[PDB]
Design an enzyme around this catalytic site. Sequence first.
Site, short mmCIF file in Angstrom:
data_model
loop_
_atom_site.label_atom_id
_atom_site.label_comp_id
_atom_site.label_asym_id
_atom_site.label_seq_id
_atom_site.Cartn_x
_atom_site.Cartn_y
_atom_site.Cartn_z
N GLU A 70 0.81 -1.21 0.00
CA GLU A 70 0.00 0.00 0.00
C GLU A 70 0.85 1.26 0.00
OE1 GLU A 70 -3.20 -0.42 -0.28
OE2 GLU A 70 -3.59 -2.45 0.46
N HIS A 109 1.61 2.22 -3.51
CA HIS A 109 0.56 3.02 -4.14
C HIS A 109 0.71 4.49 -3.79
CE1 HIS A 109 -0.77 -0.82 -5.16
NE2 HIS A 109 -1.73 -1.00 -4.27
N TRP A 139 -20.31 -21.33 -19.93
CA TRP A 139 -19.52 -21.02 -18.74
C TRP A 139 -18.75 -22.25 -18.26
CZ3 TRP A 139 -17.63 -17.28 -15.76
CH2 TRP A 139 -17.23 -17.61 -14.45
N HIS A 152 -16.83 -9.15 -8.10
CA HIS A 152 -16.51 -8.24 -9.20
C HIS A 152 -17.56 -8.30 -10.31
CE1 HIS A 152 -12.83 -9.24 -7.03
NE2 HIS A 152 -12.34 -8.08 -7.41
ZN LIG Z 1 -3.00 -2.60 -3.81
#
Ligand SMILES: [Zn+2]
Lengths: 195, 596
Positions: free
Chosen positions: B357, B360, B459, B487
Amino acid sequence: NLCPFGEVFNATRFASVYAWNRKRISNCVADYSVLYNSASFSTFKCYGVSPTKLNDLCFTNVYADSFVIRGDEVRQIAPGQTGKIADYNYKLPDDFTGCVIAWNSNNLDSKVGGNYNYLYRLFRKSNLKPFERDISTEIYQAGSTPCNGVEGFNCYFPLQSYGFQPTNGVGYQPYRVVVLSFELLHAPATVCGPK
Amino acid sequence: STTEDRAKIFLDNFNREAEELSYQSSLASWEYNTNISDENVQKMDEAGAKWSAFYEEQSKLAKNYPLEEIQTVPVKLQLQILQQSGSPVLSEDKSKRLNSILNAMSTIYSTGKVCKPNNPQECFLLEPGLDNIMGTSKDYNERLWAWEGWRAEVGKQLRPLYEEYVVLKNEMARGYHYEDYGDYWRRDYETEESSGSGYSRDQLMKDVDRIFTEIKPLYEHLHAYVRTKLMDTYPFHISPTGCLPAHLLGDMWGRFWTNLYPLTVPFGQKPNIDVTDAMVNQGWDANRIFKEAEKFFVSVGLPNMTEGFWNNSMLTEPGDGRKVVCHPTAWDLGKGDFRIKMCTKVTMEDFLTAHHEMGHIQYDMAYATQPYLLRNGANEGFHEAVGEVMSLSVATPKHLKTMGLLSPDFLEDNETEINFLLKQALNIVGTLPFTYMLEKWRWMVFRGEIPKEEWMKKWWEMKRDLVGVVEPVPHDETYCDPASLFHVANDYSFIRYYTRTIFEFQFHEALCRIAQHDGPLHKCDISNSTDAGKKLHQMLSVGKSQPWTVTLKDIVDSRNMDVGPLLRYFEPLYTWLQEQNRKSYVGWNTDWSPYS
Ligand SMILES: [Zn+2]
Ligand SMILES: *[C@@H]1O[C@H](CO)[C@@H](O)[C@H](O)[C@H]1NC(C)=O
C-alpha cells in the site's frame, strides 16, 4: 532612523496574491543580516544581488510586496517564470534585482473546512506587465455568447478562491511571501546598511 | 480563438473546482471509514452527490468541445475521459432501472446467506462464515453444500437481473460510440492516439489470448501436480485424467489455489519463513513496520513519506470506542493528502501489506504533478503491479535477514525455493485461467456470441477447456455462477488482475537487471539501488499523461505485454514440476464430471 522591517514580516494580516500590498521602506538603516539568518524562512533567494553583501549596499527606495500563495507557486514568483500566478497575478521582471522571502503559514492561514478568504485570478485576457496589479472583477468571455455581466455559460468569474485546509500537503499549504525590491535612481539614497 | 484554447479554459475551471469537491468527498469518506456513524454516512453521501453531479454536468459540457479539433495531447485525454465516463445517454426510466438492478445485485451478494440442512436457522454468510469453510475444510460434502448453496441462493436471484443488466449496459456503451460494454471496458488499454501503432481495444483480446497459450504449459503441470496431491485428500471423487472439481480449490470460485498449500506442499518437513514470532519478540510495533517500509523506498531513491501521512493516517486499529473499516487501503485524497487506512497487526502479512500500500502512495505522490483527470495509473494493471513488485523484494530471505527478522543461519535449499515458488504459483498462476475465462465469458456475452439459453453451458464448457475445472453438480440456466463473484455482481472488470500479473514481473525483471542482481529472479532485492528507483519514478510520475505503450517501453524496453519475465520467474518450479509430473497424466478430459 531604523527600518520598519518588523511590520511587513511579522504581520497578523497578509493580502491575496491578486491584491498584493506594497510598502515603501525609506529614510532608515536596514539590517539585512538578521532577516537572512532567521531559519523561519524556507525561501530566501536573491536575484541580481548577492544576499551576503546586502548590508553593504545603498539604494534609493525599498519596496516590500506581500501576498499569500500555494506551496507549488513559490517558484512562479522568481524572475522569468510563467504560470497563472506570474502571468495573471504577480509578475517579476526578467531583470529583477531584489530578494524573495517566503515561509510556511499553515498554522495561521489554514482552518478546518477551508480558508476561502485567500483568492487568486484563474483567467485573464492578456498577461500582466512587470510589477502590475489587476483588481478588476469583470466576467471573462470564453465563448461567442456575451456574458452581459452575468456568470454563466462559457462565462467564468476571473477571481477564484484558494482552499487552504490544515490537512493538505506542503505543496497545497498556504505560504506567505515578502518581496524586497531595490531601486537606485539619480536621487539621494534613503535606505542604506549600518556602516 | 481556437476551441483548443477555449477548451483549456474549461479544463482549468474543472481541475480547480473538482479538486475541492473531491477533497470534500475524500475527507468525508475517510471520516466514515475511520468513525462509523449514521451521521457521518449522511455527510459522505451528500459530499459524494455533489462530486457526482458536478462531474456529470461538466461531462455534458465537455461534449461541446470537439475532440478532433484539440491538438495538445494532455487536454485531449481529459476531454475524452470526461465525455465517455459520465453522462449516461440512456433513457430516464432505464437509468433508474439500471441503478435499481445495480444496487439490488450488491445487496443480494452482501446479505445473501446459505442455511445448513437439518438446521434451517443456522445460516452462514460469505464473510467470514462461508469463506472460512471454503478455505479450510477438507470434507467433500461440506464444501459441495457451501458451493451449491451459494450458487443457488445468490446466483439464481441474480440471473434475471443480469440478463437485464447486459442489455442496459450495452445500450449505455453504444452511446459512447463503442461496440458493446466489453469494448467500453477495454478502452483503458487503448493507446488510441499515436502516429500509427495505436493500441487497439480489440488488440488487448488478441494479446491476452496469446498469453494463455504461453502460460498453458506451466498451468497444465500445476493442474496435474495439484490433482495428484488432491487425490490423497479426496480419495474417490477426483479422476486421474479428469478436470478438477470446483469446490475443492481453496475458495468459493476457484480464484486462488493458495489455500490448497497444506494439501499440495512440496516439502512438508522444511520449515516455513514466517517471521511473525520474531517480530513479536523483537518488540516490533505499527510504527516500525511502516518506518522500515519507508526506509526501503528511501533506499531506492524514492521520496520520504509526507509528515501528514505520519499524523493524519489510521495506521492501527484506534480502539477508543471508534468503529472503523479495517481493510487495507491507500488514500489519494486529492490535494497532497496521502494516508493509509490499515488496522495493522504485528504479522508478516501486514508487514508485506504495508509495503504494497505504501507503493501506491509512492505512485500517488509521483503523479500528483499531472492534472486531476490524468492522476491515475496508465492502465488498470499498472497500479497494483507496483505495490506487488516492491512486496516481492521485501519477502526475499536476504531482506528479512538484513532487517534482523530472519536468523542468519536459515537454510536456503532448493527444497525451500520450491515450497515458496509453489505457494506463489497457487495464487499468481492459478488465477490467470480463471481471470481469462471470467472476462472472456462476459466479453462474449456482451458481444452476443453466447445466448442466454446457453450462458451456463458455455460457462462450464469454458471452465473445462480453459481452466480445467468441472461443475460438481449439473447446473441449469436458472443459475448465474459467474455473478456469484463480487466483481461480476458489482460491475467491476476482472482483466486488471490478468494484466497486472504480466506487468508486475516485467517490472521485476527490469529493476533487478538494473540492480545488477546475480542469481534467480525469485531471490531479488532492489534495495539500495538508486538506479532502479529512477526508472520507477519516471514511470509513476507519467500516470495517464503518456500512452501506456510508451510508458512501459521506458522501464522494460517493450511496447507490449510479455509473459517471459513471469515464466522465467517460475522456471525453477517449471523444471521441478516436470520431473514430478512424470508417472502422472498432465492435461484434462472435458467430458468427465463428478456427477457423470
Ligand atoms: Zn494494492
Ligand atoms: C518576528 O517576531 C519575533 C517575536 O515573535 C522576533 O523575535 C523577530 O525578530 C521578528 N522578526 C521580524 C522580521 O520582525
